[PDB]
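Build the 3D complex.
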Amino acid sequence: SNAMWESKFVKEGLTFDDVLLVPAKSDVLPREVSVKTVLSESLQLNIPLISAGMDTVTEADMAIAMARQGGLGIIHKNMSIEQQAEQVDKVKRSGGLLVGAAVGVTADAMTRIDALVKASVDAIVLDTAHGHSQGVIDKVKEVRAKYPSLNIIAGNVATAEATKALIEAGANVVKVGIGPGSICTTRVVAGVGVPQLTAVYDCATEARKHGIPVIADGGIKYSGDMVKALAAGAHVVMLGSMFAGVAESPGETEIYQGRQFKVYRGMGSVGAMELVPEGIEGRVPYKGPLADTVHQLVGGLRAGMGYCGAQDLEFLRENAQFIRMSGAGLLESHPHHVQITKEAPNYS
Amino acid sequence: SNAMWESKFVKEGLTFDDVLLVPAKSDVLPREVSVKTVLSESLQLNIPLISAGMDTVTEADMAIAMARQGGLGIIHKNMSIEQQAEQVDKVKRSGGLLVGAAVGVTADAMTRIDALVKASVDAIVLDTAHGHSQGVIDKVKEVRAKYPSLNIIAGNVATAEATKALIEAGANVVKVGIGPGSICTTRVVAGVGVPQLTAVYDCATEARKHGIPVIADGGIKYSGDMVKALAAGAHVVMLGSMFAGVAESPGETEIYQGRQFKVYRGMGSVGAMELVPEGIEGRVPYKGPLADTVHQLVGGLRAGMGYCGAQDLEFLRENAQFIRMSGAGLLESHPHHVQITKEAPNYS
Amino acid sequence: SNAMWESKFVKEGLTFDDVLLVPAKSDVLPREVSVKTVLSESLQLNIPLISAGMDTVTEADMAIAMARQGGLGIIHKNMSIEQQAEQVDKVKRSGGLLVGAAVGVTADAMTRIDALVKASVDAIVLDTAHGHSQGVIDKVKEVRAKYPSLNIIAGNVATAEATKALIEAGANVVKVGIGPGSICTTRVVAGVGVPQLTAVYDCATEARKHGIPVIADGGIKYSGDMVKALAAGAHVVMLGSMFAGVAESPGETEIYQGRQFKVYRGMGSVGAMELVPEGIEGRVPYKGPLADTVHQLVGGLRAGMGYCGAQDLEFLRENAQFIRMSGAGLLESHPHHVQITKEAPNYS
Amino acid sequence: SNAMWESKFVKEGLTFDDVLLVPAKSDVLPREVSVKTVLSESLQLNIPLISAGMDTVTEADMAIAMARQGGLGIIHKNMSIEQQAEQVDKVKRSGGLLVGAAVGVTADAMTRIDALVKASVDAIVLDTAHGHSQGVIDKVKEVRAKYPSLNIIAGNVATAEATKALIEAGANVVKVGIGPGSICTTRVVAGVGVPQLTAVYDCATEARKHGIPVIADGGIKYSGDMVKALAAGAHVVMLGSMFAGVAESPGETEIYQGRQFKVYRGMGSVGAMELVPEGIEGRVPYKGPLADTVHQLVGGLRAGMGYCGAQDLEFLRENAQFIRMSGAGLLESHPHHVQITKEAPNYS
Ligand SMILES: N/C=N\c1c(C(=O)O)ncn1[C@@H]1O[C@H](COP(=O)(O)O)[C@@H](O)[C@H]1O
Ligand SMILES: N/C=N\c1c(C(=O)O)ncn1[C@@H]1O[C@H](COP(=O)(O)O)[C@@H](O)[C@H]1O
Ligand SMILES: N/C=N\c1c(C(=O)O)ncn1[C@@H]1O[C@H](COP(=O)(O)O)[C@@H](O)[C@H]1O
Ligand SMILES: N/C=N\c1c(C(=O)O)ncn1[C@@H]1O[C@H](COP(=O)(O)O)[C@@H](O)[C@H]1O
Ligand SMILES: [K+]
Ligand SMILES: [K+]
Ligand SMILES: [K+]
Ligand SMILES: [K+]
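Done.
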């Protein structure tokens, strides 16, 4: 048979829980490493964390808190153009903080982008389920032509070919992830995706050739997953579930069975779209102020970089090595054969 | 040692949960794709769905509802010849809808087929546990000789060699699946089967040479599984469990623990055969009208084809690529690390 | 480094749940296949089943029932020489039924063997934890010299080298299995074993060269596992757990939580040895008369042989092919995504 | 791309639960094998067991009990220099028993070492999270220069390169393990580690070239795991969880749900450090006197060595072979398909 028929099952992919980072010679202290990342000359983050553009994760208060921590918030698009620009302006006016804003790849995308730019947004996230679509390429080209110095984050993709296409269209950051999200059912209902560590590595392999940073978006459930994503080639990670329970996320806290929870739902869930949904609606434990969660995340990254001998994220991306393991490896890696009696601040 | 001794463990097989479809360049919208499939010039389905010929899945009301949705129902064989022909006639008389009917590979198969043909059945399913048996080949040849223009669906098989044999015997559709069914214990009690995605791919590899469509029968538990089966080479899928809970299936709805359920059982279960059974008896949640389940199934397929750049199912079969993953990949692919609070229409 | 250091992790092994048997062209009916097996010219079994020589599995009543079903019982050794010979004689006097008896590889083994031979035992099982020990080889040679026509079953082993050694010592049947038993902790507490399907295949590969049959002993939990063991090269299987709950096993039935159970324990458990044990003590559901369990076991074997085109067990051993699968393959192979409402006679 | 980018995912690693030891020709009895191990000419252990230097595992009473059993206790460092030296002296004065003591790689390490040496400690454990750090190498060199005949145990490492570096710095025992510990979250929160059997094998491969013994530290949950670690190349193992519940460990016994438990926590847990912790706090069942647990551990090792034909641990390290298995292999290896009714002394 011909080539495409015979190649159907050749590829294999890895997720975070399939690997560990191999410790390496180190003369760097975790407290000393640099976790700064340059997404563009006008978009420099002191910590490599972006909060997702989801209506249960990031509005103005979250974006302010993220920026004050050194990261970035993406204001979600499930609001009027006027309100989104208002939230962007609110963040800009809170000390000149960095802020991004999500825009769908639709006919009126440019109208929303116009108002966000008037509000001095620092980056637009052209967000779509399938970034390797001809419409997304076309929209990226159109935005780049109108706003030649605007930071354009485009996604989501999971292949080198898609990454190449968005870069050549004019995106200066590519967002990587099809289906790994904690609330995501795309892989179950449509059958489509790429295991996220392989997606990041494949997309970074291409993006590196152009000097373009990639965002590892989705499926990070512990701080070590972030370290693996950055070591696989991402400049920065995007989190939904691990931020949805913090005080500054939108949505109120509820008590269920005597415990505190916040609603967290996919943007393709029935509730968010108000259909054949590609996400579910759920709840996550309340975690208190964002600063505490960021401290645990960055602390785990600093530890991981110390173990890998990485003074900065460039060294980590370029040098860190992995070792593949089985599910037995994963069970050994977590706590095991002990009844845990207290919740740790970075493990529950 | 000789060749058959040394080859015993060489082969490896994949199931739906071992793979994901890789997203590809796309300029097609899910709502625009064609999901039409031609099983023969006289058996064209607007959607690639067949309801199984099981006594808890398909009688006349189910077959009418399936046909009105653009698919096909197989009237089960656990009834007299007279009653089966009556149900076939009932469907034909409900607007000229397409209908199929199951027939066992037994001495009196031709007598039942005669009455079904008199009733203008559109296709006979020569259904047997092991389609690669000399008796099935012989029966297919005999039916083809008597009814040269009758659509003959023959199965079940799981190998290229068996597919070749049924095609050369005169079947114009081959039904693929040994043991993946949700209610099936063939693999546990007899030890025999082939992981279903590999079975579909191997059988389609052979059937493609002859221009013969294959049905992926069994083991589909989410809409994404159907997309994978079609991308592995099947023209159409056959579902039991995902249809057994709909209003139009036979059998009444029961309340258990305050929830609504319908009985669903293997045709080789003790109850259905009334023995050494190869199926079990169980229950599945009630799902309401068939149309709602079909809408979710076809919607997931449309999404998957959009992600794969497939304007029609021919493109999907011929071009779609997979990536293999571990159980960690599967857990990332489902929702994870969130308490789900609402049932989604396509995920429970 | 040298060769033994570098080869430490090269080998890989398969268990029953790692594979399926591939269906093949068949013109044989399950009810027509032969499941007869010749362990020696004086030890011919109409069904390929031996009940384990364990003190919760086989005494005289079990051995009588097994022989009447066409199989073989091994009278366990946890009794005086006088009592064991008495139980052997009881079986012989119940219609000339076949019977075996277990003997440990100890200084006084020959004394026990002498009384069992006087009682017309048909086969001695020289049973030990580690059959590849110099003492076992020596004892096999000694018994063969004294009793040149006695059927000697020797074990347990899991390698071709050990199989070769026991055959050359004079065993005419080799018993295969280190650690797969349902009640066995050898692999957990000593770290030692070979996944049982690979153990059977490796040992049969060697034994075939000499014309010597092997017994697949341990780890069979469904009838399909027996089919896989025989297809991997074993002439016959030995079962403990699947026989321990039948009426004819020794030990009384107990009610726990309103359900009927029988005690089943490893012969290396604290209770059986009355220490550092290599087995545990447990309970299994009561199953009623042996005949019902044997009917389900042989029925599953007949189905499996029909699927494989095997008119007899020689054809199965010599021709049957496997396909390797993942844990996802295993979950597809069992019933899934259905609430089971009734216990099947061959699946619980 | 360049070499380090392309090698990121090449390596694969094994844990204890990924393998079994293959039985081999044996003429040795478990009760006859030697389990003595020479860590240095002045540090000879009659059994290959060290209790971890953790504040819920080893103080003076544990170290006395370990030494009387033929092993070694490491007095933990979570106490003043004066108190640690006092506990070392207490052990030395209980019959000249061997004792070790943990020291962090800090500026004042030498001051603590000075007091421990004045107290006649037999070995210092230079304990750190990441032994492949330039500071650890430097500290090992400094201690070796001041105390040329002191036994220096240095760790923890997981690579041949790190092992080489610590040996060349002057450590005469290397401690191996990054993240396998039962209470450890390093792999989850920092993303870093090596599956422990591969870590031991890789480190032993290097250490063998220099004649240097390695300690397999962490992740042993059954006695068979210890046998695998020693067969992979370690001279001795270090246990935390399997010793934390014994009478002689520090910390009092608590009743929870009518059962007896002792606290067991990581030394990098919030509680032990009193932060971004790399361990959790939990509890383990109370096990009674240390001697009973040691008897079960050494008994399992003796059984494993008998199965492998190893008269002593040198033979085991140099000759024992493994076979790799799936998770299905693991489930077959444990007890299965039986309800366990009594706790075994070596299996719960
Ligand atoms: N279509 C799959 N996923 C969705 C859905 C949905 O399905 O409805 N809505 C958001 N996403 C993705 O999920 C990430 C969060 O992932 P998380 O950090 O929680 O693991 C987000 O940043 C998105 O990339
Ligand atoms: N012998 C294995 N399976 C049986 C049994 C049984 O065992 O008794 N009765 C039906 N089947 C198969 O199962 C499919 C449904 O599969 P499903 O869509 O529920 O996953 C059906 O279309 C049949 O191919
Ligand atoms: N040392 C490992 N196993 C033991 C133990 C024990 O551990 O104490 N006592 C019996 N055995 C083996 O187990 C088979 C039954 O296996 P089953 O049919 O229940 O899966 C028996 O035929 C024996 O080969
Ligand atoms: N950083 C990972 N682990 C820790 C932690 C912690 O995380 O806080 N504290 C101790 N360790 C290691 O764990 C072994 C015990 O392992 P065990 O015998 O219980 O499996 C010890 O000997 C240490 O090597
Ligand atoms: K761990
Ligand atoms: K997901
Ligand atoms: K099944
Ligand atoms: K076992």
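The pocket of JQS (ligand 2) is lined by residues B 52, 54, 156, 177, 179, 181-186, 217-220, 238-241, 266-269, 278-279 (CB under 6 Å).
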